């Protein structure tokens, strides 16, 4: 990235993460950490290298096409949608644009589109919905909380709904004894206080 | 590549990929990502190192000979076919040509020929044809789509035929229940909509 | 860190340590050794990458919110709490602040907050309390001391209480024979003297 | 090589290749790719490090002696055979010669001699001769071609004989059905055409 | 060390050595080879990272306290004991002292103290004393010598006592036949002569 | 070496080779390839790190003492034996001597002494003598030659004796059939000719 060719120690890491972690919600920060300040011709190389999950990678290409069309409708030379995707642009043109004054972050825009696509694909790949997660009969409370939040991390929503869900839904799905202990704890109890009060059981 | 010798951490990676991934359609982007801005005398070293699959590597040499003959018929000194292949050229001559003003991308041309050869060899190595891929009796729809597109990726064709194949052939090979659900969904349904509507079954 | 992107050889190491060592008390120095002189936008990348233990990572985010609120109440432009956390700041603004004269160590402050959060989370994750650790019937004294101190390392307290605990509590929980040998050794005996006197048994 | 000492990441790779791949015909390009622009005092270090196969490495030393004697008979100071082999020369003398104007490629000459020796040793290590390779009763044609060419790669001969062997001998050793299909295909059929016509069986 | 942060490829190596080799007498040279010209704030990071063996690492801290107290009693600004240990000093102060003219080797002093502590801890961790090592009934003489010297390496003593022990004690503990052969060899026999004379048995 | 500290990627390689390869005759070139242009204070670090084989490493120290005494008897300031060994010299003095004009290769001398010691130790560690190596009843001739030369490599002797041994002793120990075939081949037969004539059996 920003010129020098992308090192094989990065492509192998990206391929290995996608192969092993599947599309768990932690793939998105890994993608944004591996490719920093990269031209679109590097994200394309980073995306085509993924061996399996071609059906879920075409869906990411559909999303790229939609965003490119929206930018093209909205709008050196003018950067159009097919130029942001890096499929109708030369390496010299992109590097000159990224080093121009003022610079146009074509790579940054493509990275943002990929992040949107990855958010949507991971959202679909979530196994089950939050309302289906229920506390087990004999299960440590730390395990239950660390499963509930892992499920909630995949879904994305506005802070008002999520804040309501974390505060109230969590205490609703507990077993009778844990529900009584949470109720006895009372309102305004932070997560640490809830877990440390109910850690004995 | 562009002068410095190619690092062993790249030859080992290229050999290991070809040995393990065989000629799955993801080998082509890996080849184009490992060797960037490389002289033809580096692609030759990257090709001879492949241990097995010598029959499919001679076919890549036949394709190189055909393309070299076509360029020689079409046409410092003049770059002929035997000079593009790097077998009748000196390292000093190639480096001088690649640093000359204007530069002649002899390495780029050889890389393009190898990409054409790799496309043809992978096309032959595809196990079965698209029309043979049929949905199973009890099989998740995501699995079926991610097998159908993996098979379709190997074949290369014009966008008009492929667009027709992806839109219509996919809905033709489904089982009666999935075919009914797809038909009830109606025209203009994108891939994400099809999969999310039929994900319940 | 301090500009250049964080190498993947560091993110993989941090993820692997947290995955394997869990939250044993040695994670805190590992975290402070991996990220030196790093902008807050690097600690965020280092924290989001952790796959599991999301419940214990949200608690670290609650602690970050509390510390950010306290700083905001206490107080280029003024660095507020949401700016220290790196969620409402640009990379250019942070780098300029960290290279400004005089420099404001926003990254250092965030690192200190994370260290406080990590201390609290590890303190909670300690399996059992010191008073529950008792010497076994037939157990080497070195093993007993190296289990007692490992348990005591997780708990953090003022030096006066800890000095009292190490000097007196250690000799209180021994078996009758080891208690007699420690008493025969007498006051002012350092740890090495205690272990080398009682190493025979 | 060209001054800096040879990195251990190269000696380990060379030792591991020779240990694992034995003397398969792909060792020669690996040797020519690992040591580029290297002084003779580096090839000697790269040759002595090989643990096993000392009998086949002495034969490479016999070949070096023969070539050195021929050069000595044929012919700063004059580079003689014992000087090309690097056993009677100082590092300063070799580096000065390799940086002199005009430079004498003593390292290149030694590398060429080693390549000749390696060609001869691999030729001897070939398991069986081409005429012994016969198509099996029930064997895929791709497997047969990829075994026939692997055997033919070890033997080295003039292009006229090899071209005759590849065109005619290949179609002679086939089974009756494959021989009939090849004959029905007719003259001028390239390797790809032969394999794709007979791939069905 | 001497400014740049310590690479993770060194902390992992140090942790892995201490975890695997335990406190065998070869840990001391490994510690002195990993950290060269390092500030005290790097040795502290290298010491806290050790996961297990906390009891034997507190003893190393007791030794550090003793040496720091002795230096403080013995004695920019004056470097006191709590300043040598790096717990009451800033990174800027230490770097300035280590780059000052004349430079004060605070890091070197801390390294020497750690070496003294490591010598003492390894001395305690030695399994058995030299006088307990006896030659077996049917045991190769090379094995016996290579066990005797490994035990003697852990103990540290003045050269006069050790020279007496190596010359005389070694020949005292042999079996009757080996004792007769050693006696027949006579005085002034070096170790190589003893082993090569008695290697037949 | 020549100033910068020795990388841990070299110490680990040296320790791993000595641990695995034991003292096979290929350890000597590995030692001379790992440490090039190194000060004596680096060879000492490279020697002390070896975990096992302390008996055979003390013998290398005895040899160092003998060579140091001989140099001291034979003879900035004068480099004496205890100064060549690096045990009574400062790093500044050695670096200044190695960068002085004219430079004194104290490191080179120590390296040569270690090579002499390693030759002697490997010579002792050879399992059996050449005269004990006999051809088996049913054994491939290549295997026999590659065992005979491996044994002969450990022993070091003048070229006149070794040339006599390779030419005549090799043909003396063969079985009757191979002895007849070698005799029928006649005088002046090189190793390759002998092996290729007798390779059929």
mmCIF file of N, CA, C and O in Angstrom, chain E residues 101-147:
data_model
loop_
_atom_site.group_PDB
_atom_site.id
_atom_site.type_symbol
_atom_site.label_atom_id
_atom_site.label_comp_id
_atom_site.label_asym_id
_atom_site.label_seq_id
_atom_site.Cartn_x
_atom_site.Cartn_y
_atom_site.Cartn_z
ATOM 1 N N UNK E 101 27.276 12.225 28.517
ATOM 2 C CA UNK E 101 28.734 12.145 28.448
ATOM 3 C C UNK E 101 29.336 12.716 29.723
ATOM 4 O O UNK E 101 29.308 13.946 29.920
ATOM 5 N N UNK E 102 29.887 11.885 30.617
ATOM 6 C CA UNK E 102 30.002 10.421 30.535
ATOM 7 C C UNK E 102 28.699 9.690 30.845
ATOM 8 O O UNK E 102 27.874 10.166 31.619
ATOM 9 N N UNK E 103 28.493 8.525 30.235
ATOM 10 C CA UNK E 103 27.260 7.772 30.479
ATOM 11 C C UNK E 103 27.367 6.938 31.746
ATOM 12 O O UNK E 103 28.433 6.416 32.082
ATOM 13 N N UNK E 104 26.250 6.830 32.456
ATOM 14 C CA UNK E 104 26.142 5.977 33.636
ATOM 15 C C UNK E 104 25.387 4.715 33.234
ATOM 16 O O UNK E 104 24.208 4.808 32.858
ATOM 17 N N UNK E 105 26.004 3.539 33.301
ATOM 18 C CA UNK E 105 25.344 2.304 32.829
ATOM 19 C C UNK E 105 24.371 1.746 33.861
ATOM 20 O O UNK E 105 24.590 0.703 34.487
ATOM 21 N N UNK E 106 23.256 2.456 34.050
ATOM 22 C CA UNK E 106 22.226 1.991 34.978
ATOM 23 C C UNK E 106 21.644 0.661 34.509
ATOM 24 O O UNK E 106 21.427 -0.258 35.310
ATOM 25 N N UNK E 107 21.409 0.526 33.203
ATOM 26 C CA UNK E 107 20.930 -0.740 32.672
ATOM 27 C C UNK E 107 21.927 -1.863 32.876
ATOM 28 O O UNK E 107 21.555 -2.990 33.214
ATOM 29 N N UNK E 108 23.210 -1.571 32.674
ATOM 30 C CA UNK E 108 24.236 -2.584 32.885
ATOM 31 C C UNK E 108 24.266 -3.038 34.339
ATOM 32 O O UNK E 108 24.395 -4.235 34.621
ATOM 33 N N UNK E 109 24.137 -2.097 35.279
ATOM 34 C CA UNK E 109 24.146 -2.457 36.695
ATOM 35 C C UNK E 109 22.960 -3.352 37.027
ATOM 36 O O UNK E 109 23.104 -4.364 37.722
ATOM 37 N N UNK E 110 21.773 -2.999 36.529
ATOM 38 C CA UNK E 110 20.595 -3.818 36.794
ATOM 39 C C UNK E 110 20.771 -5.208 36.201
ATOM 40 O O UNK E 110 20.410 -6.215 36.823
ATOM 41 N N UNK E 111 21.358 -5.278 35.007
ATOM 42 C CA UNK E 111 21.614 -6.564 34.373
ATOM 43 C C UNK E 111 22.557 -7.416 35.207
ATOM 44 O O UNK E 111 22.344 -8.624 35.357
ATOM 45 N N UNK E 112 23.590 -6.798 35.782
ATOM 46 C CA UNK E 112 24.512 -7.522 36.654
ATOM 47 C C UNK E 112 23.812 -8.044 37.909
ATOM 48 O O UNK E 112 24.046 -9.184 38.333
ATOM 49 N N UNK E 113 22.941 -7.229 38.511
ATOM 50 C CA UNK E 113 22.198 -7.691 39.679
ATOM 51 C C UNK E 113 21.314 -8.879 39.326
ATOM 52 O O UNK E 113 21.224 -9.847 40.090
ATOM 53 N N UNK E 114 20.653 -8.821 38.170
ATOM 54 C CA UNK E 114 19.780 -9.914 37.759
ATOM 55 C C UNK E 114 20.595 -11.178 37.537
ATOM 56 O O UNK E 114 20.151 -12.288 37.853
ATOM 57 N N UNK E 115 21.805 -11.028 37.001
ATOM 58 C CA UNK E 115 22.675 -12.179 36.787
ATOM 59 C C UNK E 115 23.056 -12.811 38.117
ATOM 60 O O UNK E 115 23.080 -14.041 38.253
ATOM 61 N N UNK E 116 23.348 -11.985 39.123
ATOM 62 C CA UNK E 116 23.630 -12.512 40.455
ATOM 63 C C UNK E 116 22.421 -13.247 41.022
ATOM 64 O O UNK E 116 22.547 -14.350 41.568
ATOM 65 N N UNK E 117 21.237 -12.651 40.894
ATOM 66 C CA UNK E 117 20.030 -13.321 41.347
ATOM 67 C C UNK E 117 19.779 -14.629 40.624
ATOM 68 O O UNK E 117 19.404 -15.630 41.238
ATOM 69 N N UNK E 118 19.985 -14.637 39.306
ATOM 70 C CA UNK E 118 19.781 -15.853 38.528
ATOM 71 C C UNK E 118 20.780 -16.935 38.911
ATOM 72 O O UNK E 118 20.431 -18.119 38.954
ATOM 73 N N UNK E 119 22.027 -16.554 39.192
ATOM 74 C CA UNK E 119 23.005 -17.532 39.656
ATOM 75 C C UNK E 119 22.549 -18.179 40.955
ATOM 76 O O UNK E 119 22.626 -19.401 41.119
ATOM 77 N N UNK E 120 22.084 -17.365 41.901
ATOM 78 C CA UNK E 120 21.617 -17.906 43.173
ATOM 79 C C UNK E 120 20.388 -18.800 43.009
ATOM 80 O O UNK E 120 20.317 -19.880 43.609
ATOM 81 N N UNK E 121 19.405 -18.373 42.209
ATOM 82 C CA UNK E 121 18.203 -19.189 42.036
ATOM 83 C C UNK E 121 18.525 -20.515 41.354
ATOM 84 O O UNK E 121 18.003 -21.566 41.744
ATOM 85 N N UNK E 122 19.377 -20.496 40.324
ATOM 86 C CA UNK E 122 19.736 -21.743 39.650
ATOM 87 C C UNK E 122 20.492 -22.654 40.606
ATOM 88 O O UNK E 122 20.303 -23.877 40.606
ATOM 89 N N UNK E 123 21.355 -22.067 41.438
ATOM 90 C CA UNK E 123 22.106 -22.835 42.421
ATOM 91 C C UNK E 123 21.169 -23.582 43.359
ATOM 92 O O UNK E 123 21.406 -24.746 43.695
ATOM 93 N N UNK E 124 20.093 -22.919 43.790
ATOM 94 C CA UNK E 124 19.087 -23.578 44.614
ATOM 95 C C UNK E 124 18.327 -24.645 43.839
ATOM 96 O O UNK E 124 17.990 -25.699 44.390
ATOM 97 N N UNK E 125 18.059 -24.398 42.561
ATOM 98 C CA UNK E 125 17.247 -25.317 41.776
ATOM 99 C C UNK E 125 18.004 -26.555 41.321
ATOM 100 O O UNK E 125 17.391 -27.443 40.719
ATOM 101 N N UNK E 126 19.303 -26.629 41.576
ATOM 102 C CA UNK E 126 20.063 -27.822 41.235
ATOM 103 C C UNK E 126 19.478 -29.032 41.956
ATOM 104 O O UNK E 126 19.209 -28.959 43.164
ATOM 105 N N UNK E 127 19.257 -30.144 41.264
ATOM 106 C CA UNK E 127 18.541 -31.273 41.873
ATOM 107 C C UNK E 127 19.302 -31.902 43.029
ATOM 108 O O UNK E 127 18.744 -32.095 44.113
ATOM 109 N N UNK E 128 20.574 -32.224 42.811
ATOM 110 C CA UNK E 128 21.355 -32.982 43.775
ATOM 111 C C UNK E 128 22.774 -32.444 43.811
ATOM 112 O O UNK E 128 23.203 -31.701 42.925
ATOM 113 N N UNK E 129 23.501 -32.826 44.852
ATOM 114 C CA UNK E 129 24.857 -32.342 45.038
ATOM 115 C C UNK E 129 25.850 -33.273 44.358
ATOM 116 O O UNK E 129 25.550 -34.429 44.051
ATOM 117 N N UNK E 130 27.050 -32.740 44.123
ATOM 118 C CA UNK E 130 28.058 -33.454 43.346
ATOM 119 C C UNK E 130 28.403 -34.791 43.990
ATOM 120 O O UNK E 130 28.527 -35.812 43.304
ATOM 121 N N UNK E 131 28.553 -34.812 45.315
ATOM 122 C CA UNK E 131 28.952 -36.033 46.003
ATOM 123 C C UNK E 131 27.933 -37.153 45.847
ATOM 124 O O UNK E 131 28.276 -38.320 46.056
ATOM 125 N N UNK E 132 26.692 -36.831 45.487
ATOM 126 C CA UNK E 132 25.687 -37.865 45.288
ATOM 127 C C UNK E 132 25.762 -38.508 43.910
ATOM 128 O O UNK E 132 25.182 -39.582 43.714
ATOM 129 N N UNK E 133 26.460 -37.891 42.961
ATOM 130 C CA UNK E 133 26.557 -38.434 41.609
ATOM 131 C C UNK E 133 27.562 -39.576 41.628
ATOM 132 O O UNK E 133 28.740 -39.372 41.935
ATOM 133 N N UNK E 134 27.102 -40.777 41.294
ATOM 134 C CA UNK E 134 27.966 -41.944 41.305
ATOM 135 C C UNK E 134 27.829 -42.665 39.971
ATOM 136 O O UNK E 134 26.751 -42.690 39.375
ATOM 137 N N UNK E 135 28.929 -43.253 39.505
ATOM 138 C CA UNK E 135 28.895 -44.007 38.258
ATOM 139 C C UNK E 135 28.044 -45.264 38.412
ATOM 140 O O UNK E 135 28.099 -45.948 39.437
ATOM 141 N N UNK E 136 27.251 -45.562 37.390
ATOM 142 C CA UNK E 136 26.417 -46.742 37.406
ATOM 143 C C UNK E 136 27.194 -48.002 37.097
ATOM 144 O O UNK E 136 28.353 -47.978 36.649
ATOM 145 N N UNK E 137 26.555 -49.147 37.356
ATOM 146 C CA UNK E 137 27.227 -50.431 37.085
ATOM 147 C C UNK E 137 27.569 -50.638 35.622
ATOM 148 O O UNK E 137 28.729 -50.914 35.288
ATOM 149 N N UNK E 138 26.588 -50.514 34.734
ATOM 150 C CA UNK E 138 26.785 -50.652 33.294
ATOM 151 C C UNK E 138 26.343 -49.346 32.642
ATOM 152 O O UNK E 138 25.172 -49.174 32.295
ATOM 153 N N UNK E 139 27.288 -48.421 32.480
ATOM 154 C CA UNK E 139 26.980 -47.112 31.957
ATOM 155 C C UNK E 139 28.168 -46.629 31.141
ATOM 156 O O UNK E 139 29.310 -46.726 31.618
ATOM 157 N N UNK E 140 27.944 -46.121 29.931
ATOM 158 C CA UNK E 140 29.059 -45.614 29.127
ATOM 159 C C UNK E 140 29.763 -44.467 29.836
ATOM 160 O O UNK E 140 29.133 -43.632 30.486
ATOM 161 N N UNK E 141 31.088 -44.438 29.700
ATOM 162 C CA UNK E 141 31.885 -43.440 30.404
ATOM 163 C C UNK E 141 31.575 -42.030 29.920
ATOM 164 O O UNK E 141 31.593 -41.082 30.713
ATOM 165 N N UNK E 142 31.296 -41.867 28.625
ATOM 166 C CA UNK E 142 30.912 -40.553 28.121
ATOM 167 C C UNK E 142 29.634 -40.054 28.783
ATOM 168 O O UNK E 142 29.535 -38.876 29.145
ATOM 169 N N UNK E 143 28.647 -40.934 28.950
ATOM 170 C CA UNK E 143 27.423 -40.543 29.641
ATOM 171 C C UNK E 143 27.710 -40.110 31.075
ATOM 172 O O UNK E 143 27.188 -39.091 31.539
ATOM 173 N N UNK E 144 28.542 -40.871 31.789
ATOM 174 C CA UNK E 144 28.887 -40.516 33.163
ATOM 175 C C UNK E 144 29.592 -39.171 33.257
ATOM 176 O O UNK E 144 29.282 -38.366 34.142
ATOM 177 N N UNK E 145 30.546 -38.908 32.368
ATOM 178 C CA UNK E 145 31.240 -37.629 32.422
ATOM 179 C C UNK E 145 30.286 -36.489 32.092
ATOM 180 O O UNK E 145 30.307 -35.435 32.740
ATOM 181 N N UNK E 146 29.421 -36.684 31.093
ATOM 182 C CA UNK E 146 28.488 -35.642 30.682
ATOM 183 C C UNK E 146 27.332 -35.455 31.653
ATOM 184 O O UNK E 146 26.596 -34.471 31.523
ATOM 185 N N UNK E 147 27.143 -36.362 32.606
ATOM 186 C CA UNK E 147 26.247 -36.095 33.723
ATOM 187 C C UNK E 147 26.965 -35.439 34.893
ATOM 188 O O UNK E 147 26.420 -34.528 35.527
#
